[PDB]
């Protein structure tokens, strides 16, 4: 079932150069052009899912070889114990979610405790097969990653059939903060100045007023006074007001980032290089 599901999604997306082998290793078969490369970038839903099937396939394969007669009972129990402890080393699920290192370390610890109670008085050898603790640990990890994979895979497929949303309103974050600050300032100035003037003509005039604003801000940074020849006083009042607002925000951020840098907290990189210009 699983193998057919993942092949149909892959081939659906149009990737026939990526090959799933029957142990759920996703291998490229060929050298890829960048477009091939960008389309075959492939998310954590697919990979995490695939790794999860790989764990399953592994255990079911052990019981198969028990049933085929190739192995033994004791060797079966030791086998699945070895699987449930070494999922780190056999699978690689940790790459796609790294939080799982908690379950992996727990299985390692349960290993130690079970061995040195088990192997007391006899041997270093591989004989083992008390798999109940590790099995529980993995079952619980499963208990909580069902809603992850259902939300992820739900999104991946509902996008795959129905396409992504057109709107996509993007939040304000660290990178695109001060661009938004600009935009709100420019709008905020056009509002006032357009509400002052008598009526008839705006748009070229609208464009020109903003150039006076930015010029005036540049003058504020350089400490140059920014007088202008004949300009209506009220407009000058407006521009000075908003430039004092922007100057206050600019200075306050200059100080805040500076104490943040002093005490040692992580200020990134260009916030330092940007800061020192402000200061």
């Amino acid at each position: 079932q699983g193998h057919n599901m993942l092949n149909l999604l892959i081939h659906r997306k149009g990737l026939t150069y990526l090959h799933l082998d029957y142990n759920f290793n996703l291998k490229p078969t060929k050298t890829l052009t960048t477009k091939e490369r960008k389309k075959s970038r492939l998310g954590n839903s697919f990979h995490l899912m695939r790794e999860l099937l790989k764990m399953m396939k592994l255990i079911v394969d052990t019981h198969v070889q028990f049933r085929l007669g190739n192995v033994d009972a004791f060797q079966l129990a030791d086998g699945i114990h070895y699987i449930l402890n070494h999922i780190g080393q056999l699978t690689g699920i940790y790459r796609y979610k790294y939080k799982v290192m908690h379950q992996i370390r727990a299985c390692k610890d349960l290993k130690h405790i079970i061995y040195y109670k088990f192997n007391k008085n006899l041997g270093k050898g591989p004989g083992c097969g008390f798999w109940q603790p590790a099995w529980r640990v993995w079952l619980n990890f499963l208990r909580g990653t069902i809603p992850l994979l259902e939300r992820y895979i739900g999104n991946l497929i509902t996008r795959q059939f129905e396409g992504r949303s057109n709107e996509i309103v993007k939040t304000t974050t660290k990178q695109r903060l001060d661009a938004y600050y600009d935009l709100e300032l420019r709008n905020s100035v056009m509002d006032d100045i357009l509400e002052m003037m008598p009526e008839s003509i705006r748009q070229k005039k609208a464009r020109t007023i903003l150039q006076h604003l930015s010029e005036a801000w540049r003058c504020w940074k350089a400490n140059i006074p920014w007088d202008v020849p004949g300009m209506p006083a009220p407009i000058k009042k407006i521009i000075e007001r908003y430039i004092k607002s922007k100057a206050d925000a600019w200075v306050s951020a200059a100080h805040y980032n500076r104490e943040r840098i002093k005490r040692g907290a992580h200020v990134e990189k260009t916030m330092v290089k940007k800061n020192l210009g402000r200061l």
Binding site: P147, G154, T158, F161, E162, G163, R164, S165, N166, M197, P198, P232
Partner: protein
């Protein structure tokens, strides 16, 4: 006058009833068996001749529900109702 008590108790109810219809329908639309826990013959054919009974068949839970649903853009024509009346030196200074 103020709206009055008996009228405000009316529109409060009829709106509150209406909104729940939107919230319920909207929760039960999207993909969640989890979030959906918060939630008529209808036709006399034309002249009424045949009559009708309508029953909505249950879809297969694997297949995409709303098979016709796909995200697409639409440019909307302008609404029917029309014509709301608007009813409303310095050039050298400004």
């Amino acid at each position: 006058p103020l709206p009055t008590k008996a009228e405000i108790q009316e529109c409060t109810a009829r709106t509150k009833s209406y909104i729940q219809r939107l919230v319920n329908a909207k929760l039960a639309n999207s993909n969640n068996r989890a979030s959906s826990r918060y939630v008529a013959p209808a036709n006399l054919l034309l002249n009424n001749s045949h009559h009708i009974e309508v029953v909505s068949k249950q879809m297969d839970p694997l297949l995409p529900r709303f098979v016709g649903k796909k995200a697409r853009k639409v440019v909307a024509p302008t609404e029917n109702d029309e014509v709301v009346p608007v009813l409303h030196a310095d050039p050298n200074e400004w």
